[model samples]
Every structure is written in structure tokens, then in C-alpha cells.
Target: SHMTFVALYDYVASGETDLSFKKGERLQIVNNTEGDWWLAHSLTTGRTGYIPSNYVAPSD
Candidate 1:
């Protein structure tokens, strides 16, 4: 419900498990402790998938 993350650029899914997002799109970080791929939920798409940790950052 909180802790918004914003996409830094347009990202296309590299695999079926990966999440795609446009620049400035919002995400909810589900898990970030694993590694580079973070578990995320998209606010716009209403989808949950793994996302590149570097592709998003905390938003204001």
C-alpha cells in the first residue's frame, strides 16, 4: 500500500518472470533482499513480477 518506486527508464521483459515498465511508472517493492532482481507489484498494470532493482528507485 506504500513505498512507491519509480521507473528510471523504459524496461521490456527479458523473461516471462520479469516485469515491464515505462519511464516514470510506479511500482511497489515486494522484496529487495534477494539480489539484483527485486520482487515488485506494478501500480499501473496491477501485475506482480520480478524487476531489475536498478531500474527503479524510491519516489517522492
Candidate 2:
């Protein structure tokens, strides 16, 4: 496991704050067992939050 849940595209939060980032950002997938809510850490900001699963893809 390379912690490779990369952003498929930039996500714009529609009032759904947290787990939002710009393009080309890397998210470390910590725990996503919940499916709907994924735990991730921002490599750019060091901020961890729960992002929607569709916004990311595992690419390791």
C-alpha cells in the first residue's frame, strides 16, 4: 500500500467543507472502511479530513 488515493479531479465543496483540495493534490487514504466517508490526509497541507469516495481513486 502506497497511500495512493489520488485526486481524480479537483473538488469544489458545495457547502460540504473538509476533505476539499485543489488539483494535483495527493490524499493519503488512512481509513475508508465507511465507504461513504473516507479518511484522508492532505500531503500539501497536512490536514486530515473525510472526503467522499468518488472524488478519489486508488493508484498505487
Best by lDDT: 1
* Candidate 2 lDDT, 21-46, residue by residue in tens: 76668888888798787878888889
What residue runs in model 1 are displaced by over 4 Å at the alpha carbon? none
Off by over 4 Å in 2: 13-17
All candidates: TM-score:
0.89, 0.74
lDDT of 1 by residue, 1-60 (tens): 477999999999988999988999999999888879998989899888999898988996
Which residue pairs collide in model 1, if any? none
RMSD of each: 1.3, 2.3
Q: How many backbone clashes does candidate 1 have?
A: 0
Mark the 10 consecutive residues where model 2 has the least summed lDDT: 11-20
